[PDB]
């Protein structure tokens, strides 16, 4: 399987539950 | 040249060495 | 609408702005 691209808002995302979550949420 | 989808267990993954690595492992 | 694969040099990347950023940059 392959994931879909993450938003381009200059924010970092992590790949969780098929979605892009802000890395900062893990910070 | 895209990456494959990460697990959907509610965990966050980072993209390293062609694999999904638990973000929490980096925290 | 998927993202392209990150480097396979054992470094973890975060998805931000259509690019792979090192997770350690967030650590």
């Amino acid at each position: 399987g392959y994931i879909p691209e993450a938003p381009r808002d200059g924010q970092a995302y992590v790949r969780k539950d098929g979605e892009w979550v802000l890395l900062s949420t893990f910070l």
Side-chain angles (χ1 to χ4, degrees), chain A:
Chain A
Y2 271 52
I3 51 188
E5 165 115 73
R8 272 81 171 291
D9 58 324
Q11 260 305 269
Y13 285 105
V14 36
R15 227 325 258 101
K16 158 144 143 262
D17 27 65
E19 303 207 77
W20 294 115
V21 194
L22 253 197
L23 176 34
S24 36
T25 291
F26 295 88
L27 245 49

